[PDB]
Design a binder for this molecule. Structure first.
Ligand SMILES: *[C@@H]1O[C@H](CO)[C@@H](O[C@@H]2O[C@H](CO)[C@@H](O)[C@H](O)[C@H]2NC(C)=O)[C@H](O)[C@H]1NC(C)=O
Ligand SMILES: *[C@@H]1O[C@H](CO)[C@@H](O[C@@H]2O[C@H](CO)[C@@H](O)[C@H](O)[C@H]2NC(C)=O)[C@H](O)[C@H]1NC(C)=O
Ligand SMILES: *[C@@H]1O[C@H](CO)[C@@H](O[C@@H]2O[C@H](CO)[C@@H](O)[C@H](O)[C@H]2NC(C)=O)[C@H](O)[C@H]1NC(C)=O
Ligand SMILES: *[C@@H]1O[C@H](CO)[C@@H](O[C@@H]2O[C@H](CO)[C@@H](O)[C@H](O)[C@H]2NC(C)=O)[C@H](O)[C@H]1NC(C)=O
Ligand code: NAG
Ligand code: NAG
Ligand code: NAG
Ligand code: NAG
Ligand code: NAG
Ligand code: NAG
Lengths: 364, 231, 346, 98, 49, 49
């Protein structure tokens, strides 16, 4: 199948690559018990104004993200970095919820890389944002026939706004050469305008409620982790493992690595996680890959015989994962199916480091 | 009540850029670092008696603070832009068994001090960090990136007795705060014989050397000279 | 400004000649590379890190992942072909008689010492020690990489990504046996063992043959035999003193070892690049994003790692062509200078 | 008579002229001008077009470097032959035919 | 261009290995010239007649 | 008024390095080889002329 032919000539062929299959799966999560209060974020009486957008810190609880669809009818669920259906598998350190009310034609300003009025003066998102933006129409809750003036937004500011900064100052913006001295007038504007938010307005000018879930990636020990039960710890066996949302396959051993107390992961030259800290017992576990290697086939021509010797490259002959009669140990690895002989001939089929094979199949 | 001197910094102010263990590797990073052999400023604050001007300094993208005082004259810091009840003002106070961090808009006088035995969108009460009671040099790094206040700390005893000594000392990360404040000026707090060193961070690329035990024992500043650029 | 050399003027005249009245015997050292490291790359494991979702998308990228392995197999075959062509030029393994009086010439520093565990000469041991071998073959044997500090070694880090090193076909003991057979045949016969069957001849008459070849009558040898033998012994001692003192003579072999290590280190360190994706970890990408976005980022990483692998294979092919040219040159050197006397200048 | 040396000069000029003329290609982007892309598009779309241009120009540079490596190998072989001819014909007398 | 340079930094060590290959070629050209022409130890000069 | 191709190459980061051995020094090597060959034959290729 490798040579794509029905007739094989005499020689050694690099055919396969063997690998030890994983035995079982291990999940390891911190033993937190509380539930994250997303109901207080979403199901509220009223939301704060955008220039005073409200920030709530969510930590030390189990977060279920499939319950959010129940108590809020949203359609704008734009998630950057993390897919919203994968929020329950992996888990973060700390969550932040930024709640405000914005007009329907400005929801597109709540995105990384966007500038405008609100994205430059009221609420700015970083370009490396890892989070979700949730928006829903709230015309029936924020629309008054006499005009709702309880929602205010900044229109004038001397400079742009750095990401995740609140500016609730009320100083008069000076648009002229003369100083305002705290008195508004010509070229002296109050920088805090207010929306109308009438129910008779067309859609796109109707009020909308926005909750931005800002996620903090795994650098500290994790405090917010969703529903996934943690299994028992298995060492010295090739298993699949899950550590706070980090998935891998390998052998977990005890390590004498000296982690400083602020560290959680330990990395390699090729930017692969090879050392972990157990979130339930603070054990310094080392990750090695499972046993693998190359499989070469030493055969004569199929016109002569159909007998096959197998060379496992690199492994020791005690490392071969059986379930053999003739087993020989060469510097190239383990030779199975070829009987070693004490004689010496010319090299027919080369193997490596002075060992050759020839047609039973003998190795000399 | 204020005396300014200028001195060298040598190779000081190196901190861990992340919480990832690396052992026996040469890692290239780019962050707000204190440049090598920079010009740090020595401040002497002297009061007329041991009872019960404009010394406000600019922030300028991170501050490396250093102190060799045995007693706890230095108690905390004030960060902000205007600091006259017109905007948010970060206040860090170090108690004997507590640390308090606020962003309350209430202002103080032009000469702030902590008397003996003496709206707010963020509040942070925690275990304090000033246990370093040789000369017991204390180094701190404050920076503000993307609405996050990062405080790095280190406490190393020194024996040379000549200002900031030669050698390397990595600063471990201590405090991260999601306060989200504009900072351009800062000041210190006193309980007078205080003496402290101030340096300013710049965006620099460093090459850090992680040894067998995963400690940053050596570093190279890439923009110092062509030899280190070649390195 | 550099100096070209010391200025000289030949005292030319139409009736004046300069004739030498004495001589010296100069033994010089020339180093030629023959073979290099026989690397092998596990293509699928290097690209995907044993991931089924990555491998299914890797199956849509044709036969690059097999033709790179075919090219590396051809390079690994022609390395052993080069070594066989250079060294296996004698049909029978000759050996020196136990009496070692070759007309006063001392060959003890180049003939093998049986007291050593590997039958190599003193100069051969010096040349083996002066080159620091890195990635010599299958020395770890997949058993030295299961530690903690030993896992930090670069050979284990490149070993866990599917980048292995095949051992050479001829061991150093067999190469030393070839050089010992060639040396014993040359000393005991001259060029007759290269022309056909070995014909014995005393070394004094062999040196008389060589001087008559270069245009000097044999009575110069037969009246200056002790002086010529002392000059040859002093030159051999000077070579062994220079090889014991200066370690910078073997530049080409150390450059071959350094290039073969540096290519694998660069290929391993190319795994940390994002290549425009959100992360360089396929498990992190598959855990974070959905199926379609995971397919997009996995495809970006597959394209970047495939380009890096093709760059490595092209560089190895060019270096293999250069090594094969040097090995053909060295085989010509041995056939025309060890097995005979050369009239070609320099 | 000097067509070999003229071909060396012409190849070294042409391999740089092609590399200069390859900067006007779009490689599937909206434009081949980087400042035009940055002035027209916003961050994400501009990043997509800049990534396309980076991939195309990197592939062109790698092709140039590979061709220069092959040409350097050929010139090195010719220089080795010239050094052998200098050592044998000039510094001595050669019995080798032709 | 700062944005193009920041996007180019994610592509790895392609620039470093290309510059290394070109530097090796540039050294090899001078090595070829030296090994072709510098085959004499002393600069001889002809007699005036 | 007319832009040069070498200027267009140099404005896009492509540069040509000068050779280490200049043409006068190459001519000095060839002059030394010629004078040695004329005044000594092959004897300057094996030792002193
Ligand atoms: C650090 O900076 C200060 C000022 O920024 C330097 O002090 C100056 O020193 C020069 C020469 O001694 C004087 O001419 C200036 O008048 C000083 N400036 C001030 C404001 O006093 C100081 O020299 C710098 N340190 C080093 C090591 O160069
Ligand atoms: C943070 O506050 C500082 C004030 O300290 C602001 O800096 C001022 O910016 C205006 C216009 O950009 C200038 O006219 C002033 O001269 C600046 N003052 C100083 C002391 O530099 C700054 O714009 C604010 N915002 C940010 C994001 O830094
Ligand atoms: C030719 O040269 C050799 C050495 O190159 C000369 O041999 C040396 O002669 C001196 C004369 O006193 C001795 O002290 C040395 O011990 C000799 N050296 C060796 C290695 O034997 C030789 O004499 C020269 N012949 C002529 C005719 O000048
Ligand atoms: C041939 O060379 C060997 C090695 O140089 C000579 O052996 C040395 O002899 C001296 C004189 O006694 C000793 O001091 C050294 O220790 C010996 N070295 C070794 C490696 O054995 C030997 O004498 C020379 N001559 C003959 C005839 O063999
Ligand atoms: C919000 O909470 C109130 C009382 O806390 C409850 O009556 C109401 O049904 C909740 N809304 C939703 C959508 O669950
Ligand atoms: C819960 O976690 C803590 C800290 O990780 C640990 O000390 C404790 O043993 C855990 N409890 C159980 C039942 O595993
Ligand atoms: C294989 O295993 C044995 C014992 O487990 C060990 O002594 C030996 O060094 C290993 N390696 C080889 C190449 O035999
Ligand atoms: C500070 O410490 C004193 C005594 O150590 C204590 O009485 C006081 O309550 C503390 N203050 C705070 C805010 O913790
Ligand atoms: C809180 O801040 C607001 C800002 O508008 C201010 O009006 C109010 O007086 C403050 N409350 C105090 C100082 O108690
Ligand atoms: C690492 O720590 C151990 C134990 O503290 C110590 O013996 C060893 O010397 C340390 N390594 C270095 C390089 O200092």
């Amino acid at each position: 199948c490798t040579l794509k032919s029905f007739t094989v000539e005499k020689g050694i062929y690099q055919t396969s690559n063997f690998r030890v299959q994983p035995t079982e799966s291990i999940v390891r999560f911190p033993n937190i018990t509380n539930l994250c209060p997303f109901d207080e974020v979403f199901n509220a009486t009223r939301f704060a104004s955008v220039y005073a957008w409200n920030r709530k810190r969510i930590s030390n609880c189990v977060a279920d993200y499939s319950v959010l669809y129940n108590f809020a009818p949203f359609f704008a669920f734009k998630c950057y970095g993390v897919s919203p259906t994968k929020l329950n598998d992996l888990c973060f350190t700390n969550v932040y919820a930024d709640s405000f009310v914005i007009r329907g034609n400005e929801v597109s300003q709540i995105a990384p890389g966007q500038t405008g009025n609100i994205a430059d003066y009221n609420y700015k998102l970083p370009d490396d944002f890892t989070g979700c933006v949730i928006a829903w129409n709230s015309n029936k809750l924020d629309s008054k026939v006499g005009g709702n003036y309880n929602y205010l937004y900044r229109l004038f500011r001397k400079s742009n706004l750095k990401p995740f900064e609140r500016d609730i100052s009320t100083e008069i913006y000076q648009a002229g050469n003369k100083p305002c001295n705290g008195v508004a007038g010509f070229n002296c504007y109050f920088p805090l305008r207010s929306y109308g938010f009438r129910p008779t307005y067309g859609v796109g000018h109707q009020p909308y409620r926005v909750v931005v879930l800002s996620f903090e990636l795994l650098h500290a020990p994790a405090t917010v982790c969703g529903p996934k039960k943690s299994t028992n710890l298995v060492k010295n066996k090739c298993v699949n493992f899950n550590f706070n949302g980090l998935t891998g396959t390998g052998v977990l051993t005890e390590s004498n690595k000296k982690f400083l107390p602020f560290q959680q992961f330990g990395r390699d030259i090729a930017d692969t996680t090879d050392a972990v800290r157990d979130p339930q017992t603070l054990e310094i576990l080392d990750i090695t890959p499972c046993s693998f290697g190359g499989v070469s086939v030493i055969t004569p021509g199929t016109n002569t015989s159909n007998q096959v010797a197998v060379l496992y490259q690199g492994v020791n002959c005690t490392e071969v994962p059986v379930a053999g009669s003739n087993v020989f140990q060469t510097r190239a690895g383990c030779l199975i199916g070829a009987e070693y002989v004490n004689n010496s001939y010319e090299c027919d089929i080369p193997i490596g480091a002075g060992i050759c094979a020839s047609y039973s199949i003998i190795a000399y | 009540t204020r005396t300014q001197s200028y001195t060298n910094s040598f190779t000081r102010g190196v901190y861990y850029p992340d919480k990832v263990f690396r052992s026996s590797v040469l890692h290239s990073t780019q962050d707000l670092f204190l440049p090598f052999f920079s010009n740090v400023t020595w401040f002497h604050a002297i009061h007329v008696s041991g009872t019960n001007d404009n010394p406000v300094l600019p922030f300028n993208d991170g501050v490396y603070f250093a102190s060799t005082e045995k007693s706890n004259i230095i108690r905390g810091w004030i960060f902000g832009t205007t600091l006259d009840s017109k905007t948010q003002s970060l206040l860090i106070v170090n108690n004997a068994t507590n640390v308090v961090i606020k962003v309350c808009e209430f202002q103080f006088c032009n000469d702030p001090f902590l008397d003996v035995y003496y709206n707010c969108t963020f509040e942070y009460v925690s275990q304090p960090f000033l246990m370093d009671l040789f000369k017991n040099l204390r180094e701190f790094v404050f920076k503000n990136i993307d609405g996050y206040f990062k405080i790095y700390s280190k406490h190393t005893p020194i024996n040379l007795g000549r200002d900031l000594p030669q050698g390397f000392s990595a600063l471990e990360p201590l405090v991260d705060l999601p306060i989200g404040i504009n900072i351009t000026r800062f000041q210190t707090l006193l309980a007078g014989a205080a003496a402290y060193y101030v340096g300013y961070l710049q965006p620099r690329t460093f090459l850090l050397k992680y040894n067998e035990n995963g400690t940053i024992t050596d570093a190279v500043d890439c923009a110092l000279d062509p030899l280190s650029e070649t390195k | 400004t550099m100096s070209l050399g010391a200025e000289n003027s030949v005292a030319y005249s139409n009736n004046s000649i300069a004739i030498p009245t004495n001589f010296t015997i100069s033994v010089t050292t020339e180093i030629l590379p023959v073979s290099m490291t026989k690397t092998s790359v596990d293509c699928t494991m290097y690209i995907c890190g044993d991931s089924t979702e990555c491998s299914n998308l890797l199956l849509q990228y044709g036969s690059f992942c097999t033709q790179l392995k075919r090219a590396l197999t051809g390079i690994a075959v022609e390395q052993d072909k080069n070594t066989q062509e250079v060294f296996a030029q004698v049909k029978q393994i000759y050996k020196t008689p136990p009496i070692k009086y070759f007309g006063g010439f001392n060959f003890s520093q180049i003939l093998p010492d049986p007291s050593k565990p590997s039958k190599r000469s003193f100069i051969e041991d010096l040349l083996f020690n002066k080159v620091t071998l890195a990635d010599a073959g299958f020395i770890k044997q997949y058993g030295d990489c299961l530690g903690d500090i030993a896992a930090r070694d670069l050979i284990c880090a490149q070993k866990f990504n599917g980048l292995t090193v095949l051992p050479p076909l001829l061991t150093d003991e067999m190469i030393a046996q070839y050089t010992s057979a060639l040396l014993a045949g040359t000393i005991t016969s001259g060029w007759t063992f290269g022309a056909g069957a070995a014909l014995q001849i005393p070394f004094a008459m062999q040196m008389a043959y060589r001087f008559n070849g270069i245009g000097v009558t044999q009575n110069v040898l037969y009246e200056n035999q002790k002086l010529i033998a002392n000059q040859f012994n002093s030159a051999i001692g000077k070579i062994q003193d220079s090889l014991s003192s200066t370690a910078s003579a073997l530049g080409k072999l150390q450059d071959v070892v350094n290039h073969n290590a540096q290519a694998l280190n660069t290929l391993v360190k190319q795994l940390s690049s994002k290549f425009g994706a959100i992360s360089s970890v396929l498990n992190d990408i598959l855990s974070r994003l959905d199926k379609v976005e995971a397919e997009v980022q996995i495809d970006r990483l597959i394209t970047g790692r495939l380009q890096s692998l093709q760059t490595y294979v092209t560089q190895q092919l060019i270096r293999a062509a250069e090594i094969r040219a040097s090995a053909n040159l060295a085989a010509t050197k041995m056939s025309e200078c060890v097995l005979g006397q050369s009239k070609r200048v320099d």
